[model samples]
Target: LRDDYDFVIVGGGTSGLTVADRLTEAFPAKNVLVIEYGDVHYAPGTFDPPTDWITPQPDAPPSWSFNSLPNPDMANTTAFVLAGQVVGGSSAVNGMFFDRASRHDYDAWTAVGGSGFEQSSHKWDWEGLFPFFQKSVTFTEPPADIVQKYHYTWDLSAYGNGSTPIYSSYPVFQWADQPLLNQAWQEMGINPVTECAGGDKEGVCWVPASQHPVTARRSHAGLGHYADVLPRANYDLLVQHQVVRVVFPNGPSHGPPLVEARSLADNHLFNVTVKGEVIISAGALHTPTVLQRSGIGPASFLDDAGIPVTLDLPGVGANLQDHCGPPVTWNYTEPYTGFFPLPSEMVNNATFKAEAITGFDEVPARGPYTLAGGNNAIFVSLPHLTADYGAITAKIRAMVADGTAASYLAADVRTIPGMVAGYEAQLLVLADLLDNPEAPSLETPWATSEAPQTSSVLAFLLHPLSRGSVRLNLSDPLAQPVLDYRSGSNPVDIDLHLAHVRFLRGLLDTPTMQARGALETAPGSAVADSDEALGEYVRSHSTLSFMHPCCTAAMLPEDRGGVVGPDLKVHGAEGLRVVDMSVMPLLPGAHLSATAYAVGEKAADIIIQEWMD
Candidate 1:
C-alpha cells in the first residue's frame, strides 16, 4: 500500500465501505483509501447449509468478542458483544434483520441536541434521512404465491427506485408454527402495520431479511460496495492493520491529521498522509478507543491512563447505549401434532433434513436455509406496554431535575461536567419519548427454542435509561476496548424491564396460545403475579447486550458532552469525522443494521457537499 492518499477511512466495516464506494465514484482523482483490520472474503448467511437448524453453526468468520464489566444491578451479569472484523464490518456477520426505526426516533435526534448542533440547514430528522434510508438498499417483492401463502404486506412506495446492491426482501420459507405467535399478538389487541420500514414502526411488523430474493444468500455491503465494485484505480484498500490513532502534527486545529496505523503482522507503526480529511468509521466499540488513544477524550480519564490530552471532549467514549432484555419463555403443554411441518422436523426427521440440504444446494435456495433468523417481529410502545408508563417517565425526569442522573454514570466519567450535561439532556428527551404513545420501547423477536416444545419471544428494551462507557483497556491500549454495560444501573430501567416482562408474559394466556396449551414455565404464575418478584426476575434474566451498542461518539453540541456536531465533524478536530453507529445521538427502536447503512449514505452526502464546493 502507498504511504499517502486523499482520504483515509479507519475500520472498513459497514459504513466505512459505503463511504469508500461513494467517494471514489464521486471523485476518482481524489484517491480515497480504506484501512481495514479484516480482509475481504465471502461472509455466509447467519444460518447456512449442512448445519442443524436448531443449533447455530460454529461460525468461522473473523470477529472480535467483548466481555463487558459486570453489572451490579443485573445479578452481576456482564454484557457480551461480538463484532465482525471483516471488510464489510458487522454487516458481513450480523443477524441480517433489516429493519428501520420509527420516525420519532430520528426527530428526537434534533430535540435532544437543541440548536447549535445543526450547522447544515439539513436536519437529521425523519424528513432528512428518509431518502438515504430508501437509497441504501433495494427491496425485491416476493412471488405472488409466496406473498399469498405467508400473507406478507409491504408498500413499494416506501422504497426508492434507484438500485442498491444491498438486497432486502421476503423469505419463501418460515416455520409452520410461525403464524401461531402472530395470532397471539393480534389477539392481544396489537394491529399489524402495512409497512414498518416507512416510519410507522409500532405494533406487529414484517421486516425484510438482508438476503437475495432469488439466491437466498447473505446480501451484504461487502458485495454491493466493495468486491462487486472493485478495479477502481483511485480506490485503494490496506487490510490486516489496525488504526492506532489520527495524529494532528501541527495541533488539533491545523489541517488533515496523519493516520497512525499499526501492522498486525509485525507490530510496527506507520503513518498514512492525507491531503483531504480522515474518517473514523470504526464500529461503536472500537471508534471511541481510537479517539481516546489520540488523547481526545475526558481529560481526567486520559491523564490517569498516562495518555496526553489533545482535546478533552468528554463525550468521546461516554453516553454508551445498547438494546437489551430477558426472554419470555414458555412450553406447550399439548404441543402441535399436526400435518404442517415444524422447526422440530429439522432435528427429528432425517428426511426433512436431507430435503432442506438439497433445497439449499439448489440455485434459488429454498427451505430452512432460506430463513436467516426470521423477519417478522412485534415492536411495542411503552404506552401499550403498561398504563403506568407515565410513572416510569416521571422517575426519569426526577433524576435529571434533582441532579441524581449523573450518579447512574460509570464512576470514571461521572465527575466530568460535559458527560453529566449530555446525559441530563438525554434524559429530558427520553422522558418525552417514553411518554409519547407513538414511540416504541420494546422489541420482541420470536425464536422457536432449540428444544421444539419450548419457545421464547425475546423481549429487548429499545431505549435504556442508564448511561455507560466504552473505553481503552488501559493495560493494552490497542486491544478490544473494555465495555461497562452497567445495565439497569438507573433503577427506573428495572421498572421498564418489569413492564416488558409482564406485558409479554400475557401472551401465554391469549386464546390462541391457550388453545395450544401454552404455559409460562420460567418465572411462572407464582413469580409473574407479583411486581416485586417479576422485577427481581427481570434483573437476573435480562440479556445485558443484544449487540446494538451505539452513541459513544454522539452528535450533539460540544458544550453538551458531544464528540461530533450535526455535520459529523469532530468538534475541535478539524480534519476528522466519525461516520458510523458510534455517531448516533440515541439508539433507535429497531435492530441497527439497516440504520448503519443509511447513516453512511447521509454522511457521504454531507462530506461531498462540503469538499466538492
Candidate 2:
C-alpha cells in the first residue's frame, strides 16, 4: 500500500466498506485504503445458514471475542462481546434481517442535525435519509411460486430502484403455519405492513433478508459494496492489519493524520499517512477505545492510561446503549403431525412420532434459516409507556430548559443552548410518535425451538431508558473496555418490559393462537402469575445484547455530551470523522446493520461534497 492516501478507513466492516467503495467511486484518481483486522475468507456458499451452522472460533481470523466486565445486576456475570473480525465485518455473520429505522427515529435525528451536515448549514433528517436508504439496497420482489403459496405482499414504491449494490428480497421459503401467525397478529388488532423499508415500521410484516434471491446467498457490504468496487485501481485493501493507534503529526489538527497499524501476518509495524482524512468506523465496541488510544478521550482517563491528552472529549465513551430482550417459550400440549421435519430426517425415520413445529418452511436448506432467524416480526410501541406522556414531556422540557438535559447530551460549552432546544424538540416529536399506533417501542420476532417442541418469541425493547457506559482499561490498550450494561436498571424500563410480556401473553392466550396448544413454558404459571416475580424474571432472563451496541461516540451538539457533531467530525480534532453506529445519538427502531449501511452511504456523500465538491 502507498504511504499516503486521500482517505484511510480503519475498519473494513459494514460502514467502512460502503464508505470506501463510495469514496473510490466518487474520486477515481484519489487513493483509498481499508485496513481490516480480519480477512475475506468466508463466502455465501460455505458459510451460509441452514446448510452450514458454524459459530465463530475464539480469537479466530474473522471473529474477535471480547469479554465485558462482570455485571453487578446479573449475579456478577460476565458476557462475551462478539465483534466481526472479517473483512466484511459483522454483516458477514449477522442474521440477514434488512430493515430501516422507523420515521420517528430519523426525525429524532433531525433535531440533532440528521445524519450529515452539508456546508454545516443544511439540516437533513428523515426526508434526506430516505433516499439514501433506498439508494443503499436493491429490494427485489418475491418469486411467483412463493408469492402465490405464501400470499405475501409488498409496496414497490417503498423500496428503491433495483440499482444499488446490496441485494434484499423476501425469503422464498414460507412455513405452512407462517400465515397462521400472521392471522393471529391480525386477530390481535395489529395490521399487516406490506413494506417496512420506509420510516413507519409498525405492525406485523414479512421481513426481508439481505440475500441475493437468485443464488440464495448472503448479500452483505463485502459483496455488495466492496466487491462491486474491488477492481478499482485507486482502492487498496490491507487484510489482517490491526490499527493500534492514530498518530496526529500536529496534535490532531492542521495536518493529515498518520495511522499506526500492525500487520497480523508478520507482526510488522507500519505507518500510513492520510492526505485528506482518517475515518474511524471500527464499530461501537472499539471506536471509543481507538480514540482513547489516540489521546482523544476524557482527560482523566487518558492521564490514567499514561497517554497525553491530545483532545479531552468527555463524551467519547459515554451513553452506551443496546437492544435487550427476554426469550419466552411455549410448549405444545399435545403432539402434532403437521410439522414439516427435515426431508432427510423424515426419510430416515419413516414415522417420527413427535413432529417438530419448525418456523421454517418444509424445505430444509431453503427455509427461514435462509433469512436471518425468522421471516416475521411485530413492532409496536407500548401504549402503557406512552399513554402517560404528559409527565415525561414536562420532565424533558424542564430538564432541557434548566440545562439538566445537558448531562445526557454531548459535552460542549459552545453548543449547550442549541442542544437544549434540540432536546426539547426531540422530546415532543418522540412523545407524539410513541403515542401513535404506527410507531411502537417493542419488536418481537416469531421463532421456534425443537428441543421440546416449543414456539418462542423474544420481546425486544427497541427504545430503552436505561443508559450504560464503556470505559477504557487504563492498564492495557489491547484489553477490552469495561462495559456496564446496567440493563433494566431504569425502573420504567423494567415496567415497560414486564408490560410487553403481558401483552404477548394476552395475544398467545387468544382462542385462535391457543388452538396450537402452546402453553407458556418460561416464566411459567407460577412466575408469570405475579407482577413482581415477572418483573424479576424479565430483568434476569432478558439481559441479552441484541448484538447492537452504539451511542458511545454520538453525534450531538458538543455541550450536550456529544463527541461528534452533525458533520460526523470528532470534536476538538481535525481530519477525523466517525461514520459508524457509534456516531448514532440514539438507537433506532429497527435492526442496526441496514441503518449502518445507510450511514456509510450518507457519510460518503457528505465527505465528498465537503472535500471534493
Candidate 3:
C-alpha cells in the first residue's frame, strides 16, 4: 500500500512476526511493512475440532504441503513437510512441543567456523545466545495439583520473566499409560532430566507444549507477536502476497534492495521500496527458493535455470537437513484393562467423548485433548545407543577425507567448490556431535494415547550426516521449489539408524514392558532376525521429515560454506539478512519452532542496536 518503507520483512511467520513486533516497538518513528502469504485467523490446536465434526470450519488455516522426490538411498521413500499457510507460519500448525538445543549444539555452530569463525566479532556459541533463548518465550509452571500428580520438573531461571506471551506450559492431563513408557525409559538406563529446555537434553524430558495455561489454546506468533502489539501507527501488514524476490536495481552495491511480491489471489506483481533492510524469514523450506529466484543462490544452478546470476552463494540452497525416523511399534498382548482412560476411550466410549468435548469448551479447558500429542520424550546419545558409535563417526570422517562427501549432493551443483567445502565442514561438526555422549544423537517421543493394543516410539535421527537440497522447480520455477531429501545418502546415517534400532529393541525386554506382555509389531521377528534384515527395514520403513527442515542458508563464513555471518547478514548482500530456521548452520536437537522465535528475537536486537546507534 505504500511506495517506500523504512523496513520490509518478507514472511509473517514465527520469526518474521517476532521481528516485526520488535522493530515497530523499538522504532515507532520508522515505517515497517510485513508481507505475508496467508491471512490472520484463529489457528486451532492439533486436536481442536468443531462442535459438529463434519462441518467446514471457517477458522481453518491454509497450509503448504510439500512432497519431495523419492529418495534413492532410503528405499524410494519421499520426505513430506507441511508449512503454515496461515499468518503465524509453522508455529501455528506444529505439534506445540517446545524445547531447545543442547549447549554443545550451539558451540558446534562456531566450532565449524574453521578459520574466520574464531576471528569473527559476533559469536553464536551457547554463552552468546543463552540470554536470547531465555528472552524469547514465557514458560508457565504447571498448576499445583497437576505438577503434584505428574511430578514434572523445570527450572524457572531458564525462562524469561513473562515479558513476552509466546506461552509454553505442561498439560494438566495425560493418558493413563503415559507413565508406563516413562518407567520403561528409566528402566532401560535413560535418566530423567530436571529441565531439557536449558541445553542439557540427553535424557528423558517433560517438555512443554506451546499453549496457554488455563484455556489450553495454541499460542503462536499471530497471537503473541502480532495480535499483542498490533494497532501501532507505523506498522502495516499486507497479507496473501508472496515475496517473489529482492532485487538491487542500481547494481548490487546500491545498499538496500527492492522487494518484488505478487498477490496470491490475482497474481498481480508489485514492488515495495525498502530503505532500512529486507529480512527473509519465509522458513527453511521456502527461504532458499526466494533467494534463488532473486539470483542469489548457487551460480551454476541459477544459470542452468535460465536466471541471471547476481550472487553466486553456493551455500544458499545446500546443506538441507530434517528430522527423519523409523518407529519402533508394539502391541500389548494382555487386556491391561486397568489402563482404562486411554486415548481410545475418546472413540469407544460415547459418554466420555461427549464429556471431553464439553470440557474443551470450558473457561479452564481440561482432558485428553490438551496433551497435543504428548510432550515427554527421550533424547539418546550415540554412545548410549551402542559401543560401536565410533564406527559411525569414522565413516563420516572417511567421507570428508576421501573427498566423497560432495558426491551425496544433487548432481547439478554437487561439485561446486563452496558447497563442497561447507558440507565437509558440516560433516566434521556432525561427527563431533554424534561422538559426544552428552549430546542427543537419536530421539524417541512416545504417546501411549494412540491405543492400548498398539503403540509406537519414533526413533528420530537427531543429527544425520546425509545432505539434501532445495532447488528451483524446473517445471514451475515460480511455484513450490523442489526438495530432494536424499535421506541416508551418506551411508553413515543408516549405520546410525541401525544403532538406534538395536538400542530401542531393548524396550521389549524391559521389566515394565515384559510385565505388560508387549510384543514388537513393526520390524517384527523376521526383520529383526538378522542385522542386514533390520538395516533394510530402516531403509524401507523410515518416515522422512518430522517437519524440521533447516540449515539451507546457514550462518557460517563464506569459504566454509556459509550463506550468512553471525550477524545473520547474507555474505555479500548488503542491507539484507535472514532470520529463521533456514539460517541455522546446523539443525538443533529440538523441534524448530522454539529456535525460530529465538532467532527472530536475537536478530531484531542486533538490527535495533545497529540502527539505533
Candidate 4:
C-alpha cells in the first residue's frame, strides 16, 4: 500500500474488471489499484459446483437467492430476484448465458453521439472485444438429438472466437420431446428461427447458457478474467476497500484525479492518490450514486441530499431503463427438467431459446422508449414455496378447466371440413371454440399450478414507457443508493404481458401440440369456464424481471441532458471517465452483460490511443 498509485479503479464489477484488463495489458509499468468491497474466496483446491452449500449441485450456486420489489402496477406478487454479488460479481450467479447486444443496440448508441459508441465507427474494434468475450468461455456443441428435441441450434456466430479459457459445450437430452415444440410453433403459426445471436430474436431457437461442459458448473465468475494472469507484482489487488472520494488538486476540471479510499476492517481512511487516471465503472446502479456523492450530479437531487454540487449534469442519474416482465407458469403432467435430480451429464445437455410472438409495431426494435401503458403478467417462476394457498388452488383448477374446454372445442372445430381456410371467416365459430364452458376456471374455482416443475418458461414484454431514476441515499459515500425500481407505471407493460399470455394459450390449443399428447395440466380446462377467471390466474402467477438496466449517467450533447461527451469523457471534468452500463443510451432488448463487455473493451482502446499513443 502506497500513498499514491497510477490508476485507481473502483468497485470491481463487470466494467471495472475490463478496466483492469485494459490497464494491466497496455501499461504494465503504470501502478494500478483495484478496490473491491468483498473478500476474494480462495477455497481448497476447487469447490466448483453442487457443493453442500448449493441446492441441486454442479449447475446452481448455493448463494442464488432472488427477491421481487413491490410492483408498481400489480398489487399482488414479490419483485423478481435481479442478481447476486460474488467474486465474478453477478456472472458467477447468472445462468452462464453468454449473450450479445444486437447491432441495433450499438447503432442507437452511436446515433446519440456517445463517442466510439457508433456501430460503424467501431465495427472492427469489436474484433478486439471478441477475445475478451471468449477469454473465459469454454465452448461445446450439443448433439443432434438434443437439438431436435429442445429445438436447439448452434451457429458459429453464436460463439465468439476461443480467446478466453471458458469451457463451453452443448449436450443432448433424450427425454425432451420436440414434437410438442413443433406442434406449438405450427399451431400458433410461429416461424422457428435458427438463432437469437443477431438481428431478429422474435422466434424460437437455442440460446446458450454459460456453464462447464463436463461438470455442469457455472464458468463466469469475475475472477476468470484475472485468473488468466495472476499475482503480478506490478498490479496491486486491493479488496475490502471502499473509496470515499477522489482528490483533485487542480480543481475538479483542471487537475489529475486522486482516489481517497478507506479500509473496512478498521476505521482507516487512507488519503491515497493516483498518478495516472480515475475510471468509474462501479456498475449502473452504484456508479451514479458514487458520482452524486462526489458532487457530480443533478442540481435538484444534490440539493435534496444537501450536497454541494461540483458539476451539474442533470443526466448524471437520468435516462435510466430496465426490462421487466410478468412470468406465466403452467404445470405439466410429464416431468420437470431443470437444475437437478438428472444424470450428471444430462444437465449439461440442456438448452434454451426466446422469441417474440407479437406486439412489434407498438414497440419497435429501436424507438422512443415504451412505457407500461401496460399489458399483462405472463411469466415463469419457482412457486413451491408460495405462502398463498388460494392463489395456488385457483391455478390448478384453471388448468383443468382450460384443458377440458379445449378438448370439446377441438372436436367441433375439426368437424368443419373447411375449418382451416374458413377459420378467419368463421369468427363466431372460432370464438365459440375458445369459449367452451368446461375450460378451466380461474375465478371462483381458484386453480393452482403444479409445484416446482422444470422451468421451461418464457416471458417477453417490450416498450415500457414508464421511466425511473436511481440516485444517492445521501451525499455520504458509505450509504447504499436508494434503488427505486419504479415498475407498473406504464400500462403498455401490462398490455404487452397480456399479449404474450394470449399467444401462449393459443399455442397450447393448437392441434399439433394437442394431437401429439402435450397435455394441459393446470388451468388448461379453466379458460372455457370463464375468461375473467383465466385473466385472474394469469395475473396472479406471472411475474418476471429481464434484469437489464442502463442509460443512467447517459452520454449526449452537453445541452441535451448528457453526462459524458462524444469522447466518453465527463464534460468539464478532467482525468475521469465512466465506461460501463451507466453510459448506455438505451436498452438492447436482451441481456446487458455482453454489451457491458463490449463497452469496456471499446473504452479501454480509446483511453490507450488518447494518452498512450
Candidate 5:
C-alpha cells in the first residue's frame, strides 16, 4: 500500500524542514509529506541548551560508516560518517555554528559558469529568505553591563535589508570561555573585527554560535525554529527505514540500471511512484549518492559501479570542499576558556572582519553590519623581520610547490611581534596576529579525559584551498563512499595553511602567551615542520569540520561542465533539483549554515517561481 501527499519531500532535514514550512505556509491547505528515515528527539538539549528536553539522544539512526576509496593524496581511503538517518537530516546532528558566506564567494560562482548560485543572479532579491533566518534563529542579548566584557564589535549598519536570518549581536555566549582567549589573542597582535560578511575576512573577530546561551545547549531543528511555531508532523516518521534505491518514473538511462527500492528491514520492493516533487536533503555526501542510487550522476562512474544512469550530471560529485587547518594547540597552565572538546552545536558570541579591506573598525560601521554564525578566522600578512624574511618566504614557497605541508613558526620565531608586547613596537612594525578577544569557541582537544587546568590554544585554518571528491565504494546501498580528502593537493591551499601556521607560531613566540608560560603541545620545527610534518599533523590532531557541506552538486551551466543549471535543476534530467549545500557553486568566505539556509530559501522561492508561480 502507498500514500500520497501534495508535496512528497525526501530526506527530511534542514532544507526539508524549511521547504516544508515555506511551501505549506504559502499553501496551508496543501498536503506536504516529508519522508525521512529517522524520528525527532522530544528533548531540549536534544539539540542544545542541555535542558531536560534537550538530551543527546538522536532523532534518527546514524548512517553506516562509509570510507572514501583510497587515492594518492589521501592514502588508505579515510573513513567518513554520514548524518543520522533522522527526520531533521544532518542539521539535527550538526554542530550548530551559523554564519553566512562572503559576497565574493557567491560572486565567484557566477564567474565560474554557475548562474543561480550567485547573490545577484537571483530574479528576486534574497530578502524573501531573510525572514527564515530571523525566524529560525533565537539570540540571547547580553546585559548592557557585560557588553564591554565580550568586546563585541558589531555595527548595526552592516546588516542587509533584514532579509536573511541574523540573530541579535548584543548577546554574550556562556557556552565557551572567552576571557582567556581574549588575553591570548591580544598578545598575538590580531585586533578584533566587528564583522566579516562584507566580502572581506582578513582580520580577527567573533563567530556567532547557534545556541541560546541562557540555556546552554545546541539549538537545532525543533529547538531553533519549530519550538512553538510548528505543528508536530501528523505523518509517521519511519526510523530505521533505509532507502535502498529509487525507481524512476522512467527506466534507467545509462549508469546503474534502475530498479524498485527495497526496505532495509524487509525485502519488500516498490515500483516508481510520486504525487508531487521528490526533494532530497541528505546533505552533500549522500544527496548525490542517493541520486546515483536512483539512477543519476556521471554515466561513466555509475556504469563502472554496474548501475544504469538516468542522468549524466558529471558535476554531481565533482567539486567537494571544506575548511581545514593544522592547529598548533598550546597547553596553558591556566584554566582555558570556552568548551574546547564537548560537542556544542551552538557558537554565537564573536565576530571577524576583513583586515584586507575593513582595517580594524571600518566594516562594522557599514550596513549589513558584519557578523556571522561561526568563528572568525583572521587573514594576516607578514613582512620581513631583519634578514630572515626572504629565506622564510622561499621556504614557504617551496613547501607549497612540493605539497610538503610544513609549519614556519618553529624556525623564524623572532620576525613577528604580538599585539600585547609593546604598542611602540606595533607602531614600528605591523606584523603577527591571532584571534582578537579570543573569540568564544567550542573547540576541544583530541584527548577529552584531561583536567580543565590543562587548557590549550588552537589556530584553525578556516578557509582551505584544497579540493576533494567522494563516491560510493560499491553498489551496495549499505556501503560508504570513498572520500579522497585531497589535502595539500594544490599549491595555493598549502601556502595559505602554512602562512596561518607561521602567524600562529609567531603569536606563541610573542611574550604574551609565552610569558603566560603557554607551551606548544603540537610543536613543529622547520625541517621537522616541513610539508610532511604539517601534513601529518593535519591528518592527525588537526582535523575539524564545520559540517557545512557545499559544492557537491555545484550550480553551473553545462558549458563549464557543471551539473546543475541556473535554477538548481540537474543538467541532464527533469523533475530533479538539489536544494542543499551540495549545490553551492562557491565557498562564501563565511560559514555555510546561514548561507546554506539562504540557498534553501532561494531555491524554494525559485521552485515556486519557476514551477508554481
Candidate 6:
C-alpha cells in the first residue's frame, strides 16, 4: 500500500487492529499501515443479534479455508479448524461469551520467562490488566424487567465502566427455563456466581456477550478498535492483501525487515519496509504459518518445505492448543416448550413482555437464536465433581515426574528443558486451582432447542496437556499449514473430561431439572453405564474445539522453545514482534476474545514504551 511506514502490522483482525488503533492514537504524527488478507463485515451476518451462531461456508470470503490433519489419538479423523479471515478476526464469528482468566492462569506464565504475567509482578499480570479490560469495553446493565424476572445478577466491579468502543452486555432477554437451569446447578452443589468476568469463575452465572446494548449488535475489534482509529490521519489499511513472508534483507540481524505481500485481487506483488517494527497479529493458525514460510521454524520443517532457514526457532509453529468439548444433550419427555424473547426485544420491550409466554410461538427460531448458543453458563472445579480426585492428581503428578508430559512440546534441543519446567509449573497451578473451591476446570454452556426439543450442554475442558503442531506444506507459501491438534492424546485429559461429563449427567437427575421431565438423549442409556463406554464415546464425539487456539508463538525462555520474550519481541529477530494469541505462554481458562483485547492493550503499551524515543 505504501513504499514505507513507521510500522507495518500484518493481519487487520482483532488484536492486530487493537495494536494499530493504539499505535495511531499514541503517536498521531507517525504513519501506521495494516495489511489484511480478509475484507470487512459490518452487515447482518456479522453484527446482527441472531446472526452469532451462523458460520461462514467453507472457503468463503471470511473463512481461512484450512483444515487440520488427521489426529491419530481421536480415531484418526481430522476436524475443521475455523479462523476469521475478516477485519475483526475470529471475534466477528465467535460465540460472544466474554470471560476473564483466573489469577493462577496468569501467575503460571512467570514460570517460563513470562515475568510480568503474574499478579504481584511489575509486568502484564491481572493487576496490570484490570484497566485494559475496563478500557476495551463498557458493560451495559441488563433490562430491569428481564433481570428481575430471571433473577439475573452481576458483580459491578467485575465489569468495565470506562468508554471503550467494545460494548459487553447481557441479552435483552433470557430463556424461560434459565432459572430452572440455575436451580439445577445449585442443587448439584454448585453455587450461583454473580459474575464470571472476575478472576474467580467457579459457579453458574448469566454470562455477558460482546454486544452493544442499544443496537444489540456484535462489538468486535474491527468495529471497536479499528473504526475508532480509521478516522486518524496516520492510519491506513490495505485489505485483500496476503503477506507471503517477512523478508529480512540482512538476515534479521542488521536492519529493519521488508514485508513481502501479494495482492489477492490481481496477484500483484509488493514489498513494504517498516521504519519502526513489524508486528504479526494473524490468528493462532496463520501466525506460525507466516513465520514458517519466512524460514523461521524448525530446521527439518524448513528443509522439508524447501525454505532457506533464516532463523531456526522450533517454537515458531509448535505448542498449538485449543479448548475441546463433548456435546451432551437431553430431551424433554413432554411437549412443554421453553420461552425466550425474540430479537425484537432489543426494540419493543413492552411487546416482548406481553408476548413472552411458556410454549408460545409468536415468532419461531428467533428467541433461542438471540444469544448465539446460551445465556447461562456453569464453571466447575475438578474436585467439586470427582470422588477420585487423589487418583487424578496422582496421575498428573506422575506424568510430570516421569518426563512423559514434557514430550508434548515441540522437539527442540534448547527449548525442551524450559518447556518441561514450564509444563510442571502449569500442572502444579492447575492441580491447585482444580482442587480449590474457587477456581474452575471445566465450563458448560447450556442451551435448549425447539426443533429438537432438547436440552444441550457443551462441557469444555479448560486445561489439556495434549499439545499439537502446525507445520508448513512442503515448498509452497500459498499452501495451508498442516495442523495436528492431537486431541485426546493424553489419557489424563480424557479422564478428567469423563468425570466432568458424569457431573453434568448428574445435574439432569437433580430434583429441580428432573421436574421438567428431561431424559438423556445423547450417549444415553446404552453408553452411560460404564466408564469404558463413556470414555470411548467422549474420545469419538467430544473432541470438538471451542475455536479458541493459541500458544503457537509462546512467550517464554528461549530454551523453553519460546518464540517471543517477555517484551513480546521475537527471540532472535530484531524489529519484529508477535502481538496476538500466538504470544500467549499459557492458554488461560476462558473464551479468549477478552484476553486478546487485554494482550493488545498490553502489547501497545510495551511497544510505545520501547519505541517512543
Local accuracy of candidate 6 as per-residue lDDT tens digits, 73-93: 676666677888888888877
**Which candidate, 3 or 5, has the higher TM-score?**
3
Error of 1 at 574 (Å): 1.1
Per-residue C-alpha lDDT of model 4 across residues 1-613, encoded as one tens digit per residue: 8767777777666666766777777888887777766545421111122221112324432232334345444554544544334344455555444555333334444444433334334432234445545443546765555455444565666555655444444433222232344445545544455654543343333445454444343445355555545776556667766676666666787645667677878959876677767888766766787788777887766777787788877667665567654443444454533423222222333321111111112222111011100111111111211112233224323433453222221222223222212212112221221132211111000011222342123444433333446666554547655555545443333434444454455545667544433455434556524556555544455543556666776765555456776456777788888877888655554566666665676677777777765
| Backbone N/Cα/C clashes per model | 0, 15, 0, 102, 70, 2
For each candidate, the alpha-carbon lDDT, in order, equals 0.86, 0.71, 0.85, 0.50, 0.47, 0.74
Runs with alpha carbons beyond 4 Å of true place in candidate 5: 43-82, 114-140, 156-177, 183-187, 197-201, 213-217, 223-229, 232-240, 244-247, 251-267, 332-465, 526-541, 544-546
Ranking by lDDT: 1, 3, 6, 2, 4, 5
Two-way lDDT contest, 1 vs 2, winner: 1
lDDT of 2 by residue, 35-108 (tens): 98888865443223333222332323356665666554544445556677787888877777777778778766
> Mind giving the per-residue lDDT tens digits that candidate 1 earns over 1-613?
7768989999888888889889888888899889999888788886677676535556546899989998889989999999998889998888899999999999889888887665557588899899999999989999898888888899987886848898888888877767888888999988899999998989999988998889888887788888878888888888999999999998999968999999998999999999999999998998999999999998888998899999999898888899989877777788565525667777789998899888987877888888888778888988988964488888888989999999988787778777788888888898998987778998887634323344787678898987788988889989999898889888888888878888998898899888878777777878878888988898888889888999999998887889998889899988799999999888999988888989999999999988878
Better of 2 and 3 by TM-score: 3
Higher-ranked by TM-score: 2 or 4: 2
Question: Residue 177: error of model 3 in Å?
Answer: 0.8
Candidate RMSDs in order: 1.5, 4.6, 2.0, 15.6, 12.1, 4.5
Q: Where is model 2 poorest over a 10-residue stretch in terms of lDDT?
A: 352-361
Residue lDDT tens for model 3, 139-183: 888888988877789998778574688988888887777889899
Record all residue pairs in model 1 with backbone atoms less than 3 Å apart, i.e. clashing: none
TM-score winner: 1
Better of 1 and 6 by lDDT: 1
